[PDB]
Write an enzyme that holds these catalytic residues in place. Structure first.
Site, short mmCIF file in Angstrom:
data_model
loop_
_atom_site.label_atom_id
_atom_site.label_comp_id
_atom_site.label_asym_id
_atom_site.label_seq_id
_atom_site.Cartn_x
_atom_site.Cartn_y
_atom_site.Cartn_z
N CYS A 100 -4.37 21.14 39.99
CA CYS A 100 -4.90 20.27 38.99
C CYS A 100 -4.92 20.39 37.35
O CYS A 100 -3.98 21.70 38.03
CB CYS A 100 -6.63 19.99 39.41
SG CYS A 100 -7.25 21.40 38.61
N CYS A 139 -8.31 25.75 40.01
CA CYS A 139 -6.91 24.93 40.69
C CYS A 139 -6.00 24.41 39.32
O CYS A 139 -4.89 24.41 39.58
CB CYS A 139 -7.26 23.17 40.86
SG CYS A 139 -8.35 22.45 39.43
#
Ligand code: AVW
Length: 252
Positions: free
Chosen positions: A157, A75
């Site tokens: 992320c 991520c």
């Protein structure tokens, strides 16, 4: 018959064959995607648009596909890009450390392909397909990208990177998929910073393009979503590729 229904190019030649092949190559190359039934995947891809009106396509239409294509990607290693496709993929080709959407099963199956059917018939249309602008926005291709692109940005992320074309008219364009879909589906709970790499095009060095007004615009947007914004120029694109290729020649 001397006329085409739509303004846009029709389906890419050998489309079913081409998607299946790409699915086979991807699942054999990536070991975690090895659990995937390629014919099952194709079947969900077809069933999204076949025998359906090519101006009436929905996100749900692609939900079967999206499930069969579920993929975990690191991520924190995501590279988004806008209007600089070639360099971004050349980059992830060498790093492999970082992933564009085109590096996922779904992105890989669809990259650079055009597809549509017809209502009341099961034939693929190899003649013409709906142009996003001249015909309708809800067409098989445009709806696919919008859906996969939203999920991609949702999956990111930590620090997310974006390549931008330093010579583009507007370096950042609110109306691109990056600008309209991706920037707005990054999750402020998970994303610490969006970092932009503005690729210079002209001869060697230049301005500080991170002062460009569209970049300032991107910055204001992302900051008000409670995400940090950072920017770097890449004044010399091929020194960048020299260094990315051979990360430890000490000119780097
Ligand atoms: N009239 C139009 N003209 C151009 N594009 C259109 C138009 N109408 C719709 N589009 C859509 O906009 C895209 C053309 O803009 P792009 O390829 O330069 O880079 P994006 O930011 O979009 O897409 C790259 C980022 O978004 C997902 C990845 F994760 C990358 O980070 C095409 O795919 C079209 O589907």
């Amino acid at each position: 018959r001397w006329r085409q229904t739509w303004s846009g190019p029709g389906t890419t030649k050998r489309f079913p064959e081409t998607v299946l092949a790409r699915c086979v190559k991807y699942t054999e190359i990536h070991p975690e995607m090895r659990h995937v039934d390629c014919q099952s995947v194709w079947d969900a891809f077809k069933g999204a648009f076949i025998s359906k009106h090519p101006c009436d396509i929905t996100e749900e239409d692609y939900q079967p596909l999206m499930k069969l294509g579920t993929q975990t990607v690191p991520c924190n290693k995501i590279l988004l890009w806008s209007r600089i496709k070639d360099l971004a993929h050349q980059f992830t080709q060498v790093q492999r450390d970082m992933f564009t959407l085109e590096d996922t099963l779904l992105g890989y199956l669809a990259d650079d392909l055009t597809w549509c059917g017809e209502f009341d018939t099961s034939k693929i249309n190899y003649q013409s397909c709906p142009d996003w602008r001249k015909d309708c926005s809800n067409n098989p291709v445009s709806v696919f990208w919008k859906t996969v692109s939203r999920r991609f940005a949702e999956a990111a992320c930590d620090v997310v990177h974006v390549m931008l074309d330093g010579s583009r008219s507007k370096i950042f364009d609110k109306d691109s998929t990056f600008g309209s879909v991706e920037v707005h589906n990054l999750q402020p709970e998970k994303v610490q910073t969006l970092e932009a790499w503005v690729i210079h095009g002209g001869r060697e060095d230049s301005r500080d393009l991170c002062q460009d007004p569209t970049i300032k615009e991107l910055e204001s947007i992302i900051s008000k979503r409670n995400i940090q914004f950072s920017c770097k120029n890449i004044y010399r694109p091929d020194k960048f590729l020299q260094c990315v290729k051979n990360p430890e020649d000490s000119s780097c």
